[PDB]
Write a protein that binds this DNA or RNA. Structure first.
Ligand SMILES: Nc1nc2c(ncn2[C@H]2CC[C@@H](COP(=O)(O)OP(=O)(O)OP(=O)(O)O)O2)c(=O)[nH]1
Ligand code: NA
Length: 535
DNA sequence: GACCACGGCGCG
DNA sequence: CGCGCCGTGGTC
């Protein structure tokens, strides 16, 4: 709160103002610093940027990303946001955080610098006495912020011409399905309009309405509703296909090419470190954590993501990590034994109900393995397996019969969650879940599903994060790059010659990130594009 | 032009 | 379960 001349003393909190949220696209409008309750404002932000040794303050990573964009090696350090997020993962934004801990998120650089100063004091003290949250802050989050800033700055290479040609071809098939749909409907309408489609399917045609939408009570035309009506009329199959194509064209095929950065010639996403309730990362502007892969047209989209000339992509995927985290968290002997014997759990579980061994269909034990994690209901299983309701309800009983200890863990977690109001990851990351004692059943049980899923999902996020932190330094040694993280997968790019060495290494670092009662298995692939590298 | 709620859907 | 983005339909 004192007007001192730039530059600031070593180790001062910074407050910057950008023209827009994306650091890679943003103009730097103002720069300021605060140390010993004193504020300095820079005459010219870009020039003044070279003064700093490290970025400490609210949203440090963003300022570090922009610095790297300008060739400056300014690493991010302390960020009160990371502290607030560890106290309570509902602390996602500075607007929300400042308000909560005695400040006001402004649009001026100095006020932000001072907000960053006092907000760090208040929070760091709240953290003293929290051994395990401090270990996460120091050993995972703070260091991770730096790794992410390097991924954001690097970006990934995109095959623009390929997507541009794929757009024209996908456009022709869309015009095709549209013409057929119109015909089967006797007239044209906006097929992208959910409301107009509803009137056509259920009112003009005679089709039966299966379900209603949550907020407004309209008759749903969701995929789930259509797949059910799949044989009740030919038009719905043409519509499911039209949905797929228009979803992928408007979300990926069309907007991605226009997002290539001029200076880099690559595609840059943002890795949000303070966004989720479980401790996962999120990706935005654009979201690269949800690039299509499950359909044939999706796979054609992944081919667009390529390695620079002379480089290769290295794709590393943890196999069934959440399941293994569950085996470790619960202590289930039969579950542990599966991963211990190094035998395929899905076949293995499809032999606790059928065999054993290989002798119920694969995705039958698979859909349920994925389902126990979310608290999936019997009815939800029926639809996802095209199976009678009572066959789904029984498929779920043979599970808790085979692996009893998971049920005991679910119960234990809920009980303790009710007692102290939060649940924890293996490392102590917590999420406050208050509705565990709500008096409305639907509300209480929803809270319960968020509650016991979190320690699992959040522990896998912790394992992946720590793995990124340990892998980054080793990669920089071999002149390799970290490009993307997709929750339980990493994409790196490496020089053609070192590629295989980078793949063997990264695998070991990820597999030994943190030994559990069960081994961690990683699948690696190398290739000229994301689809090649995967598999 | 910005922003919003909604339904709907892509990924893990 | 956990995210982020799309078009539609709409306000300011
Ligand atoms: N495909 C799919 N993945 C999900 C779903 N819900 C969560 N996930 C996450 C968990 C793991 C990750 C990838 O799962 P995979 O398809 O690789 O499962 P997998 O064990 O490798 O199957 P497989 O052994 O047949 O290759 O996606 C879902 O509904 N579908
Ligand atoms: Na930061």
């Amino acid at each position: 709160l004192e007007e001192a001349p730039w530059p600031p003393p070593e180790g001062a909190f910074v407050g910057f103002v950008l023209s827009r949220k994306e650091p890679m696209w943003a103009d730097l409008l103002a720069l300021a610093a605060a140390r010993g309750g004193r504020v300095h404002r820079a005459p010219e932000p870009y020039k003044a940027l070279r003064d700093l040794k490290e970025a400490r303050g609210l949203l440090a990573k963003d300022l570090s990303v922009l610095a790297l964009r300008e060739g400056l090696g300014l690493p991010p350090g302390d960020d009160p946001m990371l502290l607030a997020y560890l106290l309570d993962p509902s602390n996602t934004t500075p607007e929300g955080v400042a308000r909560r801990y005695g400040g006001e998120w402004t649009e001026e650089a100095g006020e932000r610098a001072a907000l960053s100063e006092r907000l760090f004091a208040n929070l760091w003290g709240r953290l003293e006495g929290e051994e395990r949250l401090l270990w996460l802050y120091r050993e995972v989050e703070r260091p991770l912020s730096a790794v992410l800033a390097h991924m954001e700055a690097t970006g990934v290479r995109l095959d623009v011409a390929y997507l541009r040609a794929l757009s024209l071809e996908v456009a022709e098939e869309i015009a095709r399905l549209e013409a057929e749909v119109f015909r089967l409907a006797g007239h044209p309408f906006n097929l992208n309009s959910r409301d107009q489609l509803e009137r056509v399917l259920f009112d003009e045609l005679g089709l039966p309405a299966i379900g209603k939408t949550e907020k407004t009570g309209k008759r749903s035309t969701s995929a789930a509703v259509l797949e059910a009506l799949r044989e009740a009329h030919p038009i719905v199959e043409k519509i499911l296909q039209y949905r797929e194509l228009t979803k992928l064209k408007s979300t990926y095929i069309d907007p991605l090419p226009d997002l290539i950065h001029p200076r880099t010639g690559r595609l840059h996403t943002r890795f949000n470190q303070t966004a989720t309730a479980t401790g996962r990362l999120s990706s935005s502007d654009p979201n690269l954590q949800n690039i299509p892969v499950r359909t044939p047209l999706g796979q054609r989209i992944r081919r667009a993501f390529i390695a620079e000339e002379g480089w290769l992509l290295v794709a590393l995927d943890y196999s069934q990590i959440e399941l293994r985290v569950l085996a470790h968290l619960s202590g289930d002997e039969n579950l542990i034994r599966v991963f211990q014997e190094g035998r395929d759990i899905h076949t293995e579980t499809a032999s606790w109900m059928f065999g054993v061994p290989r002798e119920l269909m694969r995705r039958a034990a698979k859909t349920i393995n994925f389902g126990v994690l979310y608290g999936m209901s019997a009815h939800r299983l029926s639809q996802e397996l095209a199976i009678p309701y009572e066959e789904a309800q029984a498929f779920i009983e043979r599970y808790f019969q085979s692996f009893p200890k998971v049920r005991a863990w679910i119960e234990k977690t809920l009980e303790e969650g009710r007692r102290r109001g939060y649940v924890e990851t293996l490392f102590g990351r917590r999420r406050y879940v208050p509705d565990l004692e709500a008096r409305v059943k639907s509300v209480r049980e929803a809270a319960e599903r968020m509650a016991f899923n979190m320690p699992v999902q959040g522990t896998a996020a912790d394992l992946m994060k720590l793995a990124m932190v340990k892998l980054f330094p080793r990669l920089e040694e071999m002149g390799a790059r970290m490009l993307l993280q997709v929750h339980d997968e990493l994409v790196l790019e490496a020089p053609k010659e070192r590629a295989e060495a980078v793949a063997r290494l990264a695998k070991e670092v990820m597999e030994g990130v943190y030994p559990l009662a069960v081994p961690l298995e990683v699948e690696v692939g190398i290739g000229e594009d994301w689809l090649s590298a995967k598999e």
